[PDB]
Amino acid sequence: SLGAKPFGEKKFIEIKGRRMAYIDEGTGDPILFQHGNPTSSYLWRNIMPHCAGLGRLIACDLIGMGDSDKLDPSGPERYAYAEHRDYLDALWEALDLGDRVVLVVHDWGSALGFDWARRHRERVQGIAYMEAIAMPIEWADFPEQDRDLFQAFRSQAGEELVLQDNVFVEQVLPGLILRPLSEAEMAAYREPFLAAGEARRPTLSWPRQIPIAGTPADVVAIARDYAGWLSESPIPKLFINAEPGALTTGRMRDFCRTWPNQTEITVAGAHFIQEDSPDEIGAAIAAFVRRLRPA
Ligand SMILES: [Cl-]
Ligand SMILES: [Cl-]
Ligand SMILES: [Mg+2]
Ligand SMILES: [Mg+2]
Ligand SMILES: [Mg+2]
């Protein structure tokens, strides 16, 4: 169902000097839910209940996000894709996950998740993705509605727009959810970024990482790598498509549709589809996991 209560209380693990937060309920092999920008584990709160009894349900808060500690020093060079991956690889190792992990990913959680899988292909039982960054794109491929704003985030206008005005949290997020959010729900997304300044840096560093028209070249090479791999990998996949959708449309959707061993469903939503169709999403993930773990 919908609802504002969190799925569980946060547990903590020390990683490289910083305390990182995560939800961990139940027992069995892991079903790993990873959020992107500008969200936290809270994004999966109404989707995780659907998998009760199917495994150890885990949702990690990326460094500087949710209830995980903020990095200090912080600035334009902080929270890049490679730094996020360093902290996440370590937390995932600390959790003692084993070799039958089902990944459930979104937005930057999908770029981090697709890359971890390319690198640990034997420990991945299945991948469920939605509104993902599945390959490098052109501006011609970006959604028309926010093309100018994201070109601005990538320019020097980014700092005023995000660190000062908090535009990614206050405008982009609600603007890409079809239904209106309650105050408790908006408060849970706002919580880690209440303070002006560097506490909001993660939400600005992320749009500057998207691989478009060949820049930034380093993330473009990483995406080109996991795109080529996925288009040929036999691992079971679940493509949760959306209409109207946002990122995974046009050429990118045509490409994802060529991937092997994949099941597809379409749900209502723009970009943050977990807030519009949580039960349809959770039900498909549960069904996908029951096929992978026959009881
Ligand atoms: Cl972004
Ligand atoms: Cl570059
Ligand atoms: Mg400490
Ligand atoms: Mg805090
Ligand atoms: Mg298009």
Closest CA to 8 of 45, 33, 54, 40: 45
Which amino acid is residue 84, in one-letter code? Answer: H
Its sign, for the CA torsion 277, 282, 285, 287, is negative
In Å, the largest CA–CA distance within the chain is 54
Question: For residue 15, how far is its CA from the centre of ligand 4 (angstroms)?
Answer: 16
How many other C-beta atoms can be found within 10 angstroms of the C-beta atom of residue 291? 12
Q: Which ligand is nearest to the CA of 133?
A: 1
Q: Is 243 a catalytic residue?
A: no
Question: For residue 256, how far is its CA from the centre of ligand 5 (angstroms)?
Answer: 14
Residues in the annotated binding site for chloride: 37, 108
Protein residues near ligand 2, an ion, with CB under 5 A: 215-217
User: What residues have CB less than 8 Å from 227, skipping those under 6 apart?
Assistant: 134, 135, 136, 255
Q: Is 99 a catalytic residue?
A: no
Calculate the alpha carbon distances from 67 to 19, 147, 167 in Å.
Answer: 9, 31, 21
Its sign, for the CA torsion 117, 9, 179, 172, is negative
Marked catalytic residue, from 115, 131, 275, 276: 131
Inter-residue contact 201 to 75 (CB < 8 Å): yes
Q: Return phi, psi of residue 20, to 5°.
A: -105, 140
User: What residues have CB less than 8 Å from 261, skipping those under 6 apart?
Assistant: 233, 234, 235, 236, 237
Inter-residue contact 114 to 34 (CB < 8 Å): no
Sheet bearing 18-25, strands edge to edge: 11-15, 18-25, 56-60, 30-34, 101-106, 124-132, 237-244, 262-269
d(CA 111, CA 271): 15
Inter-residue contact 45 to 7 (CB < 8 Å): yes
Question: For residue 122, how far is its CA from the centre of ligand 5 (angstroms)?
Answer: 34
Q: Is 131 a catalytic residue?
A: yes
Three-state DSSP state, 114: helix
Name the DSSP letter for residue 137: B
Name the token pair of 6. Answer: 């969190």
Catalogue the long-range contacts made by 2-6 (C-beta closer than 8 Å, 24 or more residues apart).
2/46, 2/278, 3/45, 3/46, 4/182, 4/184, 4/185, 4/188, 5/45, 6/41, 6/42, 6/45, 6/188
User: What residues have CB less than 8 Å from 61, skipping those under 6 apart?
Assistant: 10, 20, 21, 22, 35, 40, 41, 67, 68
Q: Which ligand is nearest to the CA of 69?
A: 4
Experimental structure resolution, Å? 1.8
List of domains in the chain:
1-295 (3.40.50.1820)
Q: In the chain, where do the E strands start and end?
A: 11-15, 18-25, 30-34, 56-60, 101-106, 124-132, 237-244, 262-269
Q: Which ligand is nearest to the CA of 253?
A: 5
As separate numbers, helices (DSSP H) first and strands (DSSP E) second, the chain gives 11, 8
What residues are paired with 103 via a beta bridge? Answer: 32, 127
- What's the burial of 142, exposed, middle or buried (CB within 10 Å: 0-12/13-18/19+)? buried
